[PDB]
């Protein structure tokens, strides 16, 4: 909305795509890991619904 | 006693550099709005004949030499002291470069005031600061009304 | 050039003059008085900051008005696509007309009712079943509190008056659109605006030349026609 | 004369080719400003007398106004058999379009 | 027009329009980020029978 | 000390064209606000 210098905006929208993807699942091809504090990784939906009492 | 101290501290104008004498002469010219004769100079600095100082003063752009009587006067950049002249200058703008108000204060001591009433008249295109409404680089009002439509209608066009 | 094109220029001018901020007015007046601009020359001419330049350029993107140009001599240039601007204005005025007409049609109908506790909107037909056992107050399902009628039925004439006054203001724009429909729609290019180059400065480092590379085989969005 | 030059400047900055009558030019003149045909005829005499009285012998800056007074007395005397042409291209094959107003003598029997 | 050669990369997509339309072979591709807006619009411009063919 | 330092700074630009503002400090060793006003009247 304000003055975009056309460098931060691209990496920022990439960060939006990154976080919605990470919330969507965190078992992606491992270029990121994307945890949240503390050291335990943030547990996403494939982790919620995987094998071994993953909800199913 | 104060006059004695001033006379003791009165430095002779035969300085190390002539530029100090020139600056004092331009200060004394600027502080008087009227043209002044050569005798004012000869009384001001200890210099009598038409010297290199007087010749370079004649060659100076801000100083008008008078073939009539020898009156020397300051020359301002903006020769506008009326809103009509200001509007005609704004109409005669060949480029859209803004024009400063400090050199309009040169020549016209109450010029920012008239700028304020003409902006109140919607006669200009002003640029103003946010610390205060500041007379700055301005442009001719080729527009319609500056204060045209009210803020609620503006806000609902923003909603649009 | 075309007197109808001059009418278009004055039309855009009046649109920004009466319907946008003074900074927008100055920017668009500068770029019509002159031609396509490098940002540095404009910053020289207005003695402004990129922080101030930002939101203006952003909102002019948002209304689909200024056609930017990017080419290296990288040098930033700005112009306006005429059919893009015309159709954007056309969609804007049609959306204004339809939105204000439907808002006026809704606001001509009476209010409904307001519950001060839960602070929510209610309608008259929804309040038909909100009558209590004795038809005295309009009972609330949650708060068990009386419902009081809103103040928008007298806003019917206010929306009507706003529509009529805005229609009177845009009536020169409507007439200009009529004359445009009489005339022929023409499409701008960066090079077309280059053909009408009005020199702002004398030391512009960004050369105002359109110089595509050999084998410029790309078709780019916002830069081609069907 | 200064506001006449103002009118000439604001009529100078046209965009396309216009071929108007002296009558049309005078009518737009009286519409915009308040400059009249008889002063436009008398301007040449007025300027000549002003130069003679003023003793301004360095007329190097002053020689151009002869053209304006010439054109004004011409167009304020002649209206038929003559046309005023206005073009945006003083040089058609130029880097920048210099505009131009052109006057046309159409009948050679007059002189 | 051509279809650019599309390389999967990270969390986005790029394409290189070879497109070879000059007098020579003109092998000169531009690597431009595939904007989700343009994929969305070009998807919005597909036929329903093309959806049926494409199993949508 | 307005008048003397004006001739002194006239010597300084005569000594070197782009004289340092930090180097201007020791050549004056005077009030800098007085120095800042005097610098603005002639050059940079």
Q: Give the number of C-alpha atoms closer than 13 A to the C-alpha of residue C63, restricted to the C-beta side.
A: 24
Task: Quickly count: other Cβ atoms within 10 Å of residue D109's Cβ.
Answer: 5
Chains E and D touch, contact meaning at least 3 pairs of CB atoms under 8 angstroms apart: no
**Neighbour tally for C193: CB within 10 Å:** 23
Assess contact for B77 and B49: CB atoms under 8 A. no
**Cα C209 from chain centre:** 30
Cβ–Cβ gap C215/E17 under 8 Å: no
* Measured CA distances, B111 to A21, B92, B104, B116 (Å): 62, 18, 6, 9
Burial class (CB in 10 A: 0-12, 13-18, 19+), C27: buried
Shortest Cα distance, chain E CAs vs residue A49, angstroms: 23
Whole-Å CA distances, B79 to B96, E21, E23, E32? 20, 62, 63, 57
What secondary structure does DSSP assign to F1-44, as a single string? -HHHHHHHHHHHHHH-SS--HHHHHHHH-S-HHHHHHHHHTT--
- Show residues of chain F in contact with B11, CB under 8 Å: 3
Listed in sequence order, the DSSP H helices in D1-111 are 2-12, 22-32, 37-54, 65-75
Instruction: Classify burial at B93, counting beta carbons within 10 Å of its beta carbon; exposed 0-12, middle 13-18, buried 19 or more.
Output: middle
What is the Cα–Cα distance from C11 to E54, expressed in whole angstroms?
Answer: 48
Closest CA to C27 of C19, C18, C16: C16
| Separation in Å, CA F35 to CA D83, F9, F21 | 68, 10, 10
Q: How many residues does chain F have?
A: 44
Q: Answer yes or no: do D96 and C1 touch at CB < 8 A.
A: no
> b/e string for C133-160 if b means 16 or more Cβ within 10 A?
eeeeebbbeeeeeebeeeebeebbeebe
CA atoms of A15 and A23, how far apart (whole Å): 12
Contact B138, B93 (CB under 8 A): no
Using a CB-CB distance cutoff of 8 angstroms, which residues of chain B are in contact with residue C18? 144-145, 148-149
Please answer whether residues C101 and C163 qualify as being in contact, where contact means their C-beta atoms are separated by less than 8 angstroms.
yes
CB proximity under 8 Å: C 160-219 to E: 214-215, 217-219
For residue E27, give how far its alpha carbon lies from the nearest alpha carbon of chain C (Å): 9
B110 touches chain F (CB under 8 A): no
Using alpha carbons only, give the angle C148, C149, C151 rounded to the nearest 5 degrees: 130
Q: Which two tokens stand for residue E25?
A: 């072979």
Question: B17 in contact with F at a CB cutoff of 8 Å?
Answer: yes
Handedness of CA C126, C127, C132, C135 (dihedral sign): negative
Cα–Cα distance measured from residue D103 to residue D3, given in angstroms and rounded to the nearest whole number: 21
**Using alpha carbons only, what angle is made at residue D38 by residues D86 and D69, rounded to the nearest 5 degrees?**
50
Which tokens belong to E53? 């063919």
Q: Which two tokens stand for residue D37?
A: 């045909």
> Cβ A21–E11 below 8 Å, yes or no?
yes
Question: What is the gyration radius of the CA atoms in chain B, in angstroms?
Answer: 23
What residues are paired with D89 via a beta bridge?
A: none
Do residues B12 and B45 touch, judged by C-beta distance below 8 A? no
C-alpha–C-alpha distance, residues F16 and E17, integer Å:
59
Contact D15 C199 (CB under 8 A): no
Our CA-based measurement puts residue E12 at a distance from the nearest CA of chain A, in whole angstroms, of 8
Q: What pairs with residue E32 in β-bridges?
A: E15
Q: Are C26 and B139 inside 8 Å of each other by CB?
A: yes
Q: Which helix (H) or strand (E) holds B84?
A: helix B83-91
As a whole number of angstroms, the distance between CA C210 and CA C189 comes to: 10
Q: Which residues pair with E15 in a beta bridge?
A: E6, E32
Q: Which residues does chain C have within 8 Å of residue D16's beta carbon, measured at their own beta carbons?
A: 1
Asked if C19 lies within 8 A of B96 by C-beta distance, the reply is no
Å between B76 CA and nearest CA of chain F: 17
Distance in Å, alpha carbon of A10 to nearest chain C alpha carbon: 15
| Cβ contact, residue pair F10, B23, below 8 Å | no
**Residue numbers in C near A1 (CB within 8 A):** 55, 58
Count other Cβ atoms within 10 Å, centred on residue D103. 14
Give residues with Cβ within 8 angstroms of B7, minimum separation 6.
Answer: none
Alpha-carbon Rg for chain C in angstroms:
26
- Read off the DSSP letter of residue B108: -
Could you say which residues from 73 to 92 on chain D have a Cβ atom under 8 Å away from some Cβ of chain C? none
Q: Which of D43, D39, D83 is nearest to D65 (CA)?
A: D43
> Which residues of chain A come before a gap where C and the next N are over 2.5 Å apart?
none
Q: Where are the domains of chain C?
A: 3-83, 84-108+153-185, 109-152
Nearest residue to C110 (alpha-carbon basis) of C123, C94, C93, C100: C123
Q: Which residues of C touch D15 (CB under 8 A)?
A: 1, 6
Contact C118, C142 (CB under 8 A): yes
Contact: F7, B11; criterion CB under 8 Å: no
C173 with C93: CB under 8 angstroms? yes
Contact assessment for residue C138 and residue C113, using Cβ atoms and an 8 Å cutoff = yes
Neighbours of chain F (3+ CB pairs under 8 A): B
User: Which tokens sit at C79?
Assistant: 């112009």
3-state SS track over chain C: CCHHHHHHHHHHHHHHHHHCCHHHHHHHHHHHHCCCCCHHHHHHHHCCCHHHHHHHHHHHHHCCCCEEEEECCCEEEEECCHHHHHHHHHHHHHHHHHHHHHHHHHHHCCCCEEECCCCEEECHHHHHCCECCCCCCECCCCCCCCCECCCCCCHHHHHHHHHHHHHHHHHHHHHHHHHHHHCCCCCCCHHHHHHCCCCCCCCCCCCCCCCCCCCCCCCCCCCCCC
Asked if residue C36 lies in contact with residue C76, where contact means CB atoms within 8 angstroms, the answer is no
For B108, counting Cβ atoms within 10 Å of its Cβ (0-12 exposed, 13-18 middle, 19+ buried), the class is buried
């Amino acid at each position: 909305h304000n003055g975009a210098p056309h460098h931060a905006i691209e990496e920022a929208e990439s960060l939006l795509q990154f976080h919605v993807a990470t919330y969507m699942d965190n078992d992606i091809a491992g270029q990121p890991q994307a945890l949240q504090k503390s050291g335990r990784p943030v547990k996403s939906i494939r982790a919620r619904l995987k094998g071994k009492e993953g909800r199913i | 006693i104060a006059a004695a101290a001033l006379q003791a501290n009165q430095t002779d104008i035969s300085k190390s550099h002539d530029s100090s004498k020139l600056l004092w002469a331009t200060e004394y010219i600027q502080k008087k709005g009227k043209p002044v004769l050569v005798n004012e100079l000869l009384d001001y600095l200890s210099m009598k004949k038409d010297d290199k100082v007087i010749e370079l003063l004649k060659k100076l752009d801000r100083i008008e030499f008078d073939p009539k009587k020898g009156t020397f006067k300051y020359l301002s950049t903006y020769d506008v002291h009326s809103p009509s002249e200001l509007l005609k200058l704004l109409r005669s703008q060949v480029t859209f470069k803004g024009i400063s108000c400090k050199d309009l204060k040169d020549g016209w001591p109450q010029c920012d005031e008239t700028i304020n009433q003409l902006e109140e008249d919607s006669k200009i295109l002003v640029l103003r600061t946010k610390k205060d409404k500041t007379p700055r680089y301005v442009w001719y009002n080729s527009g319609g009304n500056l204060k045209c439509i009210d803020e609620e209608f503006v806000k609902m066009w923003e909603n649009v | 050039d075309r007197p109808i094109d001059d009418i278009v220029k004055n039309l855009l001018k009046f649109v920004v003059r009466g319907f946008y901020g003074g900074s927008f007015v100055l920017v668009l007046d500068a770029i019509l008085f002159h031609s396509v601009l490098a940002e540095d020359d404009l910053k020289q001419l207005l003695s402004i900051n990129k922080t101030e330049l930002g939101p203006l350029i952003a909102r002019l993107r948002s209304d689909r008005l200024i056609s930017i140009h990017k080419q290296r001599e990288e040098r930033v240039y700005y112009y306006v696509k005429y059919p893009h601007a015309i159709d954007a204005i056309k969609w804007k005025v049609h959306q204004v007309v339809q939105r204000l007409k439907d808002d006026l049609d809704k606001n001509s109908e009476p209010n409904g009712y307001m519950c001060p506790i839960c602070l929510t909107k209610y309608t008259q037909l929804e309040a038909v079943q909100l009558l209590n056992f004795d038809r005295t107050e309009f009972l609330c399902s949650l708060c068990d509190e009386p419902l009081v009628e809103d103040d928008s039925g007298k806003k019917n004439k206010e929306k009507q008056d706003k529509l009529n006054r805005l229609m009177d203001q845009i009536q020169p724009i409507i007439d200009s659109l009529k004359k445009i429909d009489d005339s022929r729609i023409e499409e701008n290019t960066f090079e077309i605006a280059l053909a009408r180059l009005i020199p702002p400065q004398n030391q512009s480092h960004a050369a105002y030349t359109y110089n595509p590379k050999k084998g410029s085989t790309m078709f780019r969005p916002g830069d081609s026609a069907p | 004369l200064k506001r006449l030059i103002e009118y000439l400047k604001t009529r100078m900055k046209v965009l396309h080719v216009i071929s108007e009558t002296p009558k049309s030019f005078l009518q737009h003149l009286k519409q915009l400003t308040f400059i009249e045909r008889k002063p436009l005829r008398f301007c040449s005499e007025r300027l000549s007398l002003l130069v003679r009285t003023l003793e301004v012998t360095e007329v190097e800056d002053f020689t151009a106004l002869k053209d304006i007074a010439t054109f004004a007395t011409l167009i304020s005397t002649y209206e038929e058999g003559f046309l005023l042409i206005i073009e945006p291209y003083e040089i058609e094959n130029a880097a920048v379009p210099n505009p131009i107003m052109r006057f046309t003598c159409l009948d050679a029997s007059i002189a | 027009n051509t279809q650019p050669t599309i390389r999967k990369d990270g969390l986005k997509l790029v394409g290189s329009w070879k497109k070879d339309r000059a007098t020579g072979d003109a092998d000169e591709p531009e690597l431009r980020v595939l904007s989700t807006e343009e994929i969305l619009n070009i998807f919005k411009h597909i036929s329903v029978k093309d959806f049926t063919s494409l199993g949508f | 000390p307005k008048k003397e330092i004006l001739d002194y700074l006239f010597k300084l630009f005569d000594e070197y064209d782009y004289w340092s503002l930090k180097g201007l400090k020791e050549r004056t060793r005077q009030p800098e606000a007085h120095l800042k006003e005097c610098l603005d009247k002639v050059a940079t």
